Design a protein around this motif. Structure first.
Motif, PDB file in Angstrom:
ATOM      1  N   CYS A 383       0.881  -1.197   0.440  1.00 24.12           N
ATOM      2  CA  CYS A 383       0.134  -0.018  -0.259  1.00 24.12           C
ATOM      3  C   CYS A 383       0.993   1.134  -0.132  1.00 24.12           C
ATOM      4  O   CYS A 383       1.751   1.067   1.162  1.00 24.12           O
ATOM      5  N   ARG A 384       0.874   1.812  -0.644  1.00 25.55           N
ATOM      6  CA  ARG A 384       1.339   3.438  -0.507  1.00 25.55           C
ATOM      7  C   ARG A 384       1.077   4.392   0.119  1.00 25.55           C
ATOM      8  O   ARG A 384       2.055   4.820   0.685  1.00 25.55           O
ATOM      9  N   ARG A 385       0.305   4.277   1.082  1.00 20.82           N
ATOM     10  CA  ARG A 385      -0.476   5.828   1.710  1.00 20.82           C
ATOM     11  C   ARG A 385       0.135   4.945   2.684  1.00 20.82           C
ATOM     12  O   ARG A 385       1.428   5.352   3.990  1.00 20.82           O
ATOM     13  N   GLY A 406      -6.912  -0.569   2.276  1.00 23.39           N
ATOM     14  CA  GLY A 406      -7.257  -1.149   1.248  1.00 23.39           C
ATOM     15  C   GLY A 406      -8.616  -1.572   0.292  1.00 23.39           C
ATOM     16  O   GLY A 406      -8.577  -2.246  -0.595  1.00 23.39           O
ATOM     17  N   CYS A 410      -8.327   3.886  -1.639  1.00 22.84           N
ATOM     18  CA  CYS A 410      -6.636   3.861  -1.361  1.00 22.84           C
ATOM     19  C   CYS A 410      -5.281   4.602  -2.386  1.00 22.84           C
ATOM     20  O   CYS A 410      -5.215   5.384  -2.593  1.00 22.84           O
ATOM     21  N   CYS A 411      -4.821   3.470  -2.781  1.00 23.23           N
ATOM     22  CA  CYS A 411      -3.805   3.690  -3.638  1.00 23.23           C
ATOM     23  C   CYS A 411      -4.224   1.959  -5.075  1.00 23.23           C
ATOM     24  O   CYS A 411      -4.392   2.075  -4.465  1.00 23.23           O
ATOM     25  N   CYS A 414      -3.572  -1.291  -3.549  1.00 22.45           N
ATOM     26  CA  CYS A 414      -4.828  -1.535  -2.827  1.00 22.45           C
ATOM     27  C   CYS A 414      -5.949  -1.828  -3.802  1.00 22.45           C
ATOM     28  O   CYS A 414      -6.811  -2.995  -4.071  1.00 22.45           O
TER      29      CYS A 414
END
Ligand SMILES: CCc1c(N2CCN(C(=O)c3ncnc(C)c3O)CC2)c(=O)n2nc(C3=CCOCC3)nc2n1CC(=O)Nc1ccc(C(F)(F)F)cc1Cl
Ligand SMILES: [Zn+2]
Length: 419
Positions: A383-385, A406, A410-411, A414
């Motif tokens: 996940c980038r975040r 998730g 999000c990114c 995900c």
């Protein structure tokens, strides 16, 4: 990880003071940013923190053995902070009209490191501050609940407008304005009403679920890479206000050249342009006369713009911390925004070569570590975040972000893991 972000590195004397009086072995990166700028540059600050706020303004006067003045209307909280300071063997006091003559004498003598006052007391006692500055030296003036000086804030107080004379009466004393609101418009009003000069703005402690993160491979054919972001209109345009950050001046010229062929409302910004053309691009972007700025790292600081819908890093960013400051400029209005990196392995090869041009060895190693973190982020399947927050935000922001992590908003990682 936190130690890697500290630039420059704290010295042993600074670390010893932190352990002895504040019970901590290391500075958090945002705390160090405010503290270092006050101690070494006497720089005004605007510290936006959503909820270790006190260390920023308590540590510098304690370190240099001088006086830090704290202005606040929250009387009970000031009394609690005075009490906490005394329990840590730090001389501190609340100074007001009911204080004893004996206490003011020791303040005048430089025996108290931290002195808390209300804004009304401070306004009617400027001569005392001029005396403390001339005899002892005031390390900083902290202005808590600083949003109270703004007429368009949610808690305007008459007692705050008079703090605009602090900068005239004590021109060498830096001011650290603190607030829990991350409002971009309230921040510009804090800066203006307090007469802050080139203030360092920090903003931390907030989760930002409205920022979508994506990393994608480039082809190098500029138009082919940017077309998915463009919308044909009568010419072509982006969905909204956009910044395209490039690694060099030449890339800003090439990218601007391709979008100009489309009659897109755009302008270039780099540190090689004249002062007048740079001011023109800045002004046109905030007045919405241009939709997109194609820029190097030189553009961004001091931009009061809440409605940036898209940030595009056209080329692998060189530094993880700079990347974080840049994407943090998107969607300050809380509405949906996107931050995309378009990269190719050749960008990383070139970034690594330019790193050998930094002559200061300590700064080159700091920049190398920021580059390695950026490279790991770009190549990651996670996940980038999660990666960004783990580097820059506290455990409560990380825990608060678990709601978006998730999910499809999000990114890109995900979204791919989902289906
Ligand atoms: C990056 C810090 C930041 C900012 N800055 C932008 C850069 N900056 C300057 O340009 C600047 N620096 C110096 N001096 C001057 C004069 C300047 O203007 C400092 C302030 C900034 O302006 N804001 N505004 C907010 C708001 C939060 C909630 O209410 C709305 C606005 N939060 C921020 N932050 C924190 C932030 O963005 N963290 C974050 C969280 C999650 C993700 C993600 F992983 F999920 F994607 C990504 C990020 Cl980066
Ligand atoms: Zn994610």
């Amino acid at each position: 990880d936190d130690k890697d972000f500290l630039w420059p590195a704290p010295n042993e004397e600074q670390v010893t003071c932190l352990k002895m009086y504040f019970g901590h072995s290391s500075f958090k990166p945002v705390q160090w940013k405010v503290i270092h700028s006050v101690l070494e540059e006497a720089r005004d600050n605007v510290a936006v923190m959503a909820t270790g706020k006190s260390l920023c303004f308590q540590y510098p006067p304690v370190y240099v053995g001088k006086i830090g003045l704290v202005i606040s209307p929250l009387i009970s909280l000031m009394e609690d902070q005075v009490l906490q300071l005394k329990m840590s063997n730090i001389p501190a006091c609340f100074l007001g009209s009911a204080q004893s003559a004996n206490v003011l004498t020791d303040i005048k003598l430089g025996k108290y490191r931290i002195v808390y006052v209300t804004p009304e007391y401070c306004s009617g006692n400027m001569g005392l501050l001029q005396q403390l500055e001339a005899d002892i030296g005031i390390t900083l003036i902290a202005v808590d609940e600083a949003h109270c000086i703004s007429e368009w804030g949610h808690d305007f107080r008459d007692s705050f407008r008079k703090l605009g004379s602090l900068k005239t009466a004590l021109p060498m004393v830096p001011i650290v304005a603190l607030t829990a609101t991350a409002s971009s418009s309230i921040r510009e009003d804090i800066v203006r009403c307090l007469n802050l000069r080139n203030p360092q703005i920090t903003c931390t402690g907030f989760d930002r679920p409205n920022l979508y993160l994506e990393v994608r491979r480039k082809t190098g054919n500029i138009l082919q890479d940017l077309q998915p972001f463009l919308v044909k209109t009568s010419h072509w345009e982006f969905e909204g206000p956009t910044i395209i950050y490039c690694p060099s001046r030449k890339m800003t010229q090439q990218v601007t050249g391709e979008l100009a062929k489309l009659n897109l409302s755009c302008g270039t910004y780099h540190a090689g342009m004249s002062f007048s053309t740079a001011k023109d691009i800045h002004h046109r972007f905030v007045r919405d006369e241009i939709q997109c700025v194609i820029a190097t790292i030189a553009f961004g600081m001091g931009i009061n713009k809440a409605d940036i819908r898209q940030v595009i890093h056209y080329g692998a960013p060189k530094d993880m911390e700079s990347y974080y400051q840049e994407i943090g400029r998107a969607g300050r209005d809380g509405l949906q925004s996107s931050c995309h990196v378009l990269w190719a392995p050749a960008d990383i090869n070139l970034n690594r070569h330019l790193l050998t041009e930094i002559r200061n060895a300590k700064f080159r190693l700091y920049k190398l570590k920021m580059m390695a973190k950026m490279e790991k982020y770009l190549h990651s399947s996670r996940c980038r975040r999660q990666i960004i927050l783990s580097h820059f935000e506290d455990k409560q922001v990380q825990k608060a972000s678990l709601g978006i992590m998730g999910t499809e908003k999000c990114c890109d990682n995900c979204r791919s893991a989902l289906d």
